[PDB]
Amino acid sequence: MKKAVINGEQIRSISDLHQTLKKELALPEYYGENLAALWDALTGWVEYPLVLEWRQFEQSKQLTENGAESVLQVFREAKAEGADITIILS
């Protein structure tokens, strides 16, 4: 029962978001910090079930120039294909 928390108001960049995910999801040390790497990690590395709690999403969306949305998209696409992921947008 893996748990990951993102405090959106603390995200000051897209790389900030990737470094946070790297920690929260115990991603490989070689983590590419890009969408392809994230998709790869979610479908071939990460432990499940997983609960991702994304707080202050909008705030993180502003400081990442919509990049926050593309990251959420990967999580949603991984779930769509079978990854046991529960996303909580607070």
């Binding site: 490989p28 998709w39 593309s70």
Partner: protein, 108 residues
């Protein structure tokens, strides 16, 4: 087993399919693979993850309507997966990455 960049690239170009030591993520899962466990070599000796669709969401690889990309693990033997991947398109363009998709090198 053929799991090196040139060996797999040549194989893809010549037979238009990956070598037999490759299986998709779903197939591996059906064999008992659990990524977080790093048990691929245990449930599927000699196999590497490969053949799954590569979305190319960030458009780093040549994009063209009708062209579909797929990827495969390179240099994998056992345990947890590495950062090496070969990327091949439906029209057989072949690229590689050794830094977990940060940068790509065209090899064919």
């Amino acid at each position: 087993v053929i799991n090196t960049f040139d060996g797999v690239a040549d194989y893809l170009q010549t037979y238009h399919k990956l070598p037999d030591n490759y299986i998709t993520k779903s197939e591996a899962q059906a064999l008992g693979w659990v990524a977080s466990k790093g048990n691929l070599a245990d449930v599927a000796p000699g196999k590497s993850i490969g053949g799954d669709i590569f979305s190319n969401r960030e458009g780093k690889l040549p994009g063209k309507s009708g062209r579909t990309w797929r990827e495969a693990d390179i240099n994998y033997t056992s345990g947890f997966r590495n950062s090496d991947r070969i990327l091949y398109s439906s029209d057989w363009l072949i690229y590689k990455t050794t830094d977990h998709y940060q940068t790509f090198t065209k090899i064919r």
